[PDB]
Structure formats: structure tokens, C-alpha cells
Design an enzyme around this catalytic site. Structure first.
Site, mmCIF file in Angstrom:
data_model
loop_
_atom_site.group_PDB
_atom_site.id
_atom_site.type_symbol
_atom_site.label_atom_id
_atom_site.label_comp_id
_atom_site.label_asym_id
_atom_site.label_seq_id
_atom_site.Cartn_x
_atom_site.Cartn_y
_atom_site.Cartn_z
ATOM 1 N N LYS A 217 3.404 2.269 -2.388
ATOM 2 C CA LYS A 217 2.692 1.012 -2.658
ATOM 3 C C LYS A 217 1.208 1.228 -2.365
ATOM 4 C CE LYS A 217 2.564 -3.968 -1.800
ATOM 5 N NZ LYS A 217 2.632 -5.056 -0.798
ATOM 6 N N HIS B 40 3.108 -14.851 -0.906
ATOM 7 C CA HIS B 40 2.237 -13.816 -1.438
ATOM 8 C C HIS B 40 1.008 -13.729 -0.551
ATOM 9 C CE1 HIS B 40 -0.577 -11.981 -4.336
ATOM 10 N NE2 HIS B 40 -1.351 -13.035 -4.148
ATOM 11 N N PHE B 41 0.518 -12.532 -0.347
ATOM 12 C CA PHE B 41 -0.724 -12.319 0.400
ATOM 13 C C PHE B 41 -1.811 -12.118 -0.623
ATOM 14 C CE2 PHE B 41 -2.596 -11.475 4.460
ATOM 15 C CZ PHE B 41 -3.771 -10.852 4.105
ATOM 16 N N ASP B 42 -2.785 -13.029 -0.674
ATOM 17 C CA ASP B 42 -3.798 -12.971 -1.717
ATOM 18 C C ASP B 42 -5.003 -12.125 -1.323
ATOM 19 O OD1 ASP B 42 -4.037 -14.050 -4.479
ATOM 20 O OD2 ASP B 42 -5.920 -14.951 -3.706
HETATM 21 CL CL LIG Z 1 -1.481 -7.024 0.635
#
Ligand SMILES: [Cl-]
Ligand SMILES: [Cl-]
Ligand SMILES: [Cl-]
Ligand code: NA
EC number: 4.6.1.18
Length: 124
Positions: free
Chosen positions: A41, A119-121
Site C-alpha cells: 500500500k 475513510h482517512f482523507d
Molecule cells: Cl491514509
């Protein structure tokens, strides 16, 4: 098959430490949270606050997400975070990450009932 809320927890929460105190933190954590299975990732942020404090951001400052949606929230206070980013010499299966510790506001997208981060923006 993971729920969105659980995926957020797995990818982003590390309440067991107050801060990354080693250059190898990201290498270890990306592997142990199964974020290097099949692919590296490329970018991932870990938050070193309690789960409750992170879930509480969903009741804080409502802002736009980078994609234009309006279910993002920015934390009122800064939080201890670690950004993990693949280095130039990383390639699967020997993923390699740079660890950058910082104290910043977090921006999360929230959904569901209960209304929790999914979600991490960004961080600011
Ligand atoms: Cl992230
Ligand atoms: Cl897993
Ligand atoms: Cl407002
Ligand atoms: Na969910």
C-alpha cells in the site's frame, strides 16, 4: 468480508503507542496490519489516539473531502499521527516505508449508524 468501519480501524488506529519512536515503525505496522499482503500500500496514516477520540471527530468541524463530498470532519485539536509512505527503493514483496511522526489535525469521512469514520482523507 470487512465492514467499512472495521477496515478504518485496522488501517488507521494505533492507540497502543503515543508516537512512532523508530524509523522502522512503518515497516513493522504496515506488515502486521496486513497492508503489504499482495501489494505494498503506497501511503497510510496511523493515529495514536484512543478510538473514542477519533470517533468523536465525526461530531466536530464539517468540511469538504478532497473528492467534493460533504461528509468529512476536521478534528478541532491536533492528534499524534504517523505517516507511512513507500520509499523509491520499495517494491513488492519487500515493501519499505519512510516513517514521519507529526502532530496534526485529522480529516475523516464519516458514515453509518453509529456515525463513525470510514475513510482517512488528510491531515493538516
Ligand atoms: Cl491514509
Ligand atoms: Cl486482516
Ligand atoms: Cl461551521
Ligand atoms: Na461500517
Amino acid at each position: 468480508k470487512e465492514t467499512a468501519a472495521a477496515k478504518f480501524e485496522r488501517q488507521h488506529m494505533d492507540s497502543s503507542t503515543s508516537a512512532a519512536s523508530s524509523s522502522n515503525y512503518c515497516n513493522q505496522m504496515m506488515k502486521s496490519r496486513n497492508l503489504t499482503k499482495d501489494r505494498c500500500k503506497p501511503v497510510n496514516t496511523f493515529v495514536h489516539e484512543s478510538l473514542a477520540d477519533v470517533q468523536a471527530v465525526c461530531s466536530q468541524k464539517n468540511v469538504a473531502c478532497k473528492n467534493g463530498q460533504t461528509n468529512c470532519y476536521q478534528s478541532y485539536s491536533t492528534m499524534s499521527i504517523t505517516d507511512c509512505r513507500e520509499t523509491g527503493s520499495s517494491k513488492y514483496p519487500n515493501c519499505a516505508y519512510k516513517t514521519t511522526q507529526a502532530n496534526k489535525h485529522i480529516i475523516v469521512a464519516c458514515e453509518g449508524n453509529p456515525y463513525v469514520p470510514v475513510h482517512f482523507d488528510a491531515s493538516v
